[PDB]
Amino acid sequence: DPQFTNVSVHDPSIVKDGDTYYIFGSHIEAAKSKDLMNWEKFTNGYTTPNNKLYGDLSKNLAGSFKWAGENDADSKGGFAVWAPDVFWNKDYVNEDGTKGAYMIYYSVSSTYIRSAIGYAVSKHIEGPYKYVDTIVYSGFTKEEAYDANSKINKKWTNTNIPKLIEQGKLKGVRADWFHNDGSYNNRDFPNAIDPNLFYDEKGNLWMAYGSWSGGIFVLPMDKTTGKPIYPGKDGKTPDGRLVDRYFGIKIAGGYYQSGEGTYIVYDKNTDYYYLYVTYGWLGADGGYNMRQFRSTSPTGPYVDAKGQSAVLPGEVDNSPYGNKIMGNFLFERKVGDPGTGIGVGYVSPGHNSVYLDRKTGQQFLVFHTRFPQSGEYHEVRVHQMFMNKNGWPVVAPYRYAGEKLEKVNKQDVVGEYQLINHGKDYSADIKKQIFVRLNRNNTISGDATGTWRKIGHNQAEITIDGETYDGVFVRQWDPTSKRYVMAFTALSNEGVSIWGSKLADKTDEEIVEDVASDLDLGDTDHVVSNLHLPTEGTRHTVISWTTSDAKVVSETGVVHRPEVGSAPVTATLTATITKGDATATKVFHITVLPYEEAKLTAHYSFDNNDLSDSTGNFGPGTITGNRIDNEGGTIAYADGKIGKAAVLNGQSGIRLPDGLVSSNQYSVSLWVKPEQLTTHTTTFFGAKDPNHWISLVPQGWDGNTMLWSGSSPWYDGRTFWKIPTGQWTHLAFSVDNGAVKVYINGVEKFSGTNFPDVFTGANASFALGVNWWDPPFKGLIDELRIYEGALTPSQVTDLAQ
Numbered sequence: 158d159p160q161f162t163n164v165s166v167h168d169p170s171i172v173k174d175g176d177t178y179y180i181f182g183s184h185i186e187a188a189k190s191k192d193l194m195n196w197e198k199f200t201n202g203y204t205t206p207n208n209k210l211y212g213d214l215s216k217n218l219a220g221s222f223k224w225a226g227e228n229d230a231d232s233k234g235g236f237a238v239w240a241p242d243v244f245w246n247k248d249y250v251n252e253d254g255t256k257g258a259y260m261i262y263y264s265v266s267s268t269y270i271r272s273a274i275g276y277a278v279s280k281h282i283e284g285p286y287k288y289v290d291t292i293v294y295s296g297f298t299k300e301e302a303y304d305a306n307s308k309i310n311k312k313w314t315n316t317n318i319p320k321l322i323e324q325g326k327l328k329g330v331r332a333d334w335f336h337n338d339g340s341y342n343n344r345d346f347p348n349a350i351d352p353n354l355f356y357d358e359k360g361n362l363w364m365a366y367g368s369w370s371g372g373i374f375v376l377p378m379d380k381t382t383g384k385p386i387y388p389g390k391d392g393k394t395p396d397g398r399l400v401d402r403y404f405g406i407k408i409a410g411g412y413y414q415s416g417e418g419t420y421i422v423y424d425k426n427t428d429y430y431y432l433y434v435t436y437g438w439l440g441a442d443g444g445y446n447m448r449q450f451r452s453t454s455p456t457g458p459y460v461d462a463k464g465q466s467a468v469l470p471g472e473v474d475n476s477p478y479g480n481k482i483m484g485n486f487l488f489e490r491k492v493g494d495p496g497t498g499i500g501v502g503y504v505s506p507g508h509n510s511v512y513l514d515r516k517t518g519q520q521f522l523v524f525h526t527r528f529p530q531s532g533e534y535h536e537v538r539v540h541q542m543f544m545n546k547n548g549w550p551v552v553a554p555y556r557y558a559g560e561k562l563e564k565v566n567k568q569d570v571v572g573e574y575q576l577i578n579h580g581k582d583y584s585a586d587i588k589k590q591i592f593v594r595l596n597r598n599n600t601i602s603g604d605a606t607g608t609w610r611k612i613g614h615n616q617a618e619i620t621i622d623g624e625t626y627d628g629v630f631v632r633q634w635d636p637t638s639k640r641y642v643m644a645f646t647a648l649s650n651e652g653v654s655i656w657g658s659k660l661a662d663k664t665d666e667e668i669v670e671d672v673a674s675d676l677d678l679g680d681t682d683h684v685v686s687n688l689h690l691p692t693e694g695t696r697h698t699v700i701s702w703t704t705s706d707a708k709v710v711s712e713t714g715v716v717h718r719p720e721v722g723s724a725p726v727t728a729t730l731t732a733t734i735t736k737g738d739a740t741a742t743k744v745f746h747i748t749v750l751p752y753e754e755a756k757l758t759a760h761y762s763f764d765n766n767d768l769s770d771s772t773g774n775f776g777p778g779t780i781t782g783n784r785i786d787n788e789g790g791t792i793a794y795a796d797g798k799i800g801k802a803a804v805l806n807g808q809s810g811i812r813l814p815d816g817l818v819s820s821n822q823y824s825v826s827l828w829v830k831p832e833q834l835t836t837h838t839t840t841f842f843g844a845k846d847p848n849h850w851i852s853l854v855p856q857g858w859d860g861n862t863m864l865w866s867g868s869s870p871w872y873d874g875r876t877f878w879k880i881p882t883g884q885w886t887h888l889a890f891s892v893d894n895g896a897v898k899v900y901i902n903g904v905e906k907f908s909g910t911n912f913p914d915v916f917t918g919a920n921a922s923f924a925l926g927v928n929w930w931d932p933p934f935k936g937l938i939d940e941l942r943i944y945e946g947a948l949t950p951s952q953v954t955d956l957a958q
């Protein structure tokens with residue numbers, strides 16, 4: 158039934174104009190939809206001029222760009238226009254003195270603290286938006302100072318503050334804004350990004366903003382002009398939270414801890430201000446997760462279900478604070494569940510907005526998310542939310558598909574559920590389901606015990622291991638099985654959320670039959686890799702294995718490839734599948750391939766005082782400077798492992814020719830003499846483009862030698878081994894249709910499957926010592942050998958010597 162059209166809009170700020178829903182996100186991306194399911198982008202990103210939102214970007218927002226976000230520090234080469242919020246401001250006095258305009262409040266940033274918020278206006282939601290002013294600034298300093306790769310002076314005199322002191326809106330500079338060395342005190346005070354403009358009960362206008370550092374602040378705003386009404390005077394709220402003459406009132410975060418993407422919604426139905434913030438880091442390993450507080454006042458205090466304050470008491474883990482409404486999750490499609498793929502899950506879902514419909518009461522969490530097994534690729538998602546009995550909106554487990562609350566029969570609730578509990582913790586981990594059933598005697602049994610009730614038409618009360626969770630039952634589109642299913646979502650007074658999705662009713666026999674038809678080990682006629690043999694199917698179905706011949710393949714799928722030139726070798730794996738007294742059997746016919754010798758395709762020895770390929774079928778290399786795409790470094794040839802090695806001083810390396818590798822069956826060998834270790838720094842690299850690359854990393858994100866692929870998907874070829882300096886080490890890795898191996902000094906240190914295919918039918922870029930981001934390799938690398946095919950353990954224990 159339901160159709161979806163996806164868009165990649167990061168940090169979506171939703172707004173309804175007329176009958177159309179609009180989202181505005183970072184990087185000047187935006188889109189629109191009439192149904193919250195099918196999105197159509199209308200922007201052109203950082204294209205300038207004729208930028209959709211801003212026109213000639215550079216001149217329109219120059220005011221803001223004088224301070225950060227244009228070709229400066231972390232924005233070198235481009236722009237950084239982040240996390241906007243957009244609304245129709247009926248009171249805005251236009252420069253022709255007419256009333257009413259669409260405002261866009263945006264952020265610009267150059268480092269993790271040097272940022273500012275400014276706004277622009279339009280007669281029309283799609284723009285053009287013309288700059289008005291820049292109103293809040295962070296990362297400024299007590300004296301003249303510059304950042305690495307920045308010519309912008311960060312002294313506070315270079316912000317709006319002098320003008321504000323001249324206008325009588327501030328008395329002066331606050332000493333507390335500075336550390337003793339004159340640096341920006343981001344322990345106490347904010348990074349000026351991520352604005353959210355909202356209205357209170359009375360129609361007064363507020364802006365909340367912030368991201369990590371000192372946290373989230375809120376300022377009242379002049380409806381007529383778009384400017385803050387700065388407090389003018391330092392102080393403390395009645396309950397003790399920091400007030401600042403300029404930055405406003407602190408409502409969440411603190412002490413460097415995470416927390417950005419604030420969104421605040423006044424709900425007239427409950428008379429609460431609901432505060433959403435996202436903890437953690439946005440990246441696939443970041444554990445981005447959405448949090449929820451409330452207050453009776455726009456300016457707080459904001460607290461969670463447990464009555465705990467959103468404002469941190471000190472430099473502590475923020476895990477306990479805030480209802481955790483969504484983290485990493487997957488409703489795993491185990492063997493025997495209907496559909497294909499791994500099932501529906503999200504990684505790092507967050508930076509949300511919220512649409513609450515004045516008339517109907519329907520409510521929607523809007524956010525961007527990443528996904529398991531796709532790295533940094535992201536899309537916009539929308540989940541409905543539903544007010545529970547205790548005045549907390551609860552998030553639905555599935556993306557919105559037209560559903561609404563109904564009168565729900567006890568009959569349609571009773572049965573087996575997959576259940577996910579989001580807890581409080583957050584990390585790279587992905588929560589997966591357990592199995593329980595909600596029995597007609599209102600008990601709960603299975604992987605957890607307890608009780609449940611439906612109340613009124615559809616309120617849910619689930620009590621598990623002595624924890625009670627209040628929420629709703631609602632029907633939901635499960636895209637894995639492709640049915641509307643009954644579901645539940647419910648929050649406890651700890652502020653922990655559990656989710657439920659009803660499984661199709663099934664006998665033990667039908668399950669085993671399902672597990673049996675669905676059990677597949679892929680193409681097992683060309684096996685070069687260990688086979689993963691599942692020991693479990695859906696709903697705790699158990700699967701055991703035997704092998705006809707352990708010398709070919711073990712019971713756990715461990716393969717033994719025969720000698721080069723030998724015959725492929727055959728065996729049979731038998732799966733026995735049990736649940737209750739139902740049982741079935743299925744056999745699979747394996748053929749394990751012999752090793753095949755990789756053949757040398759190119760050789761950079763550096764032995765003839767140049768970057769020539771000795772095999773004489775690729776061009777010579779060229780020199781780079783400190784990145785794969787820049788020029789002007791120096792290659793000293795100096796005494797090395799065989800002949801002369803290539804030296805790299807620390808500030809360049811070698812651009813190898815395009816297309817060097819052009820397959821998914823290849824191998825790379827080289828000898829490395831490092832002086833210093835720097836994290837992420839490559840030797841051999843790597844890339845189709847800056848999102849699809851391979852890198853042989855002497856010290857990677859885990860502190861060890863690895864083979865690394867990124868950023869969509871991520872691959873962690875971890876050897877768990879650290880490499881020495883002033884010293885030669887032999888490194889080799891092979892790739893063979895997803896099959897990957899890495900060798901440290903001849904010994905195999907990593908072996909895996911599903912290695913990405915980065916170079917087949919592309920003309921990619923390759924280099925030694927340098928990439929697009931990290932410190933160049935410092936030391937020597939000798940004897941770079943590229944191959945077609947996968948080096949044999951034998952070929953490799955010979956290159957090592």
Ligand SMILES: [Ca+2]
Binds near residue numbers: 168169170241352508
């Ligand atoms: Ca936002």
Ligand SMILES: [Ca+2]
Binds near residue numbers: 761763799800802939
């Ligand atoms: Ca050499």
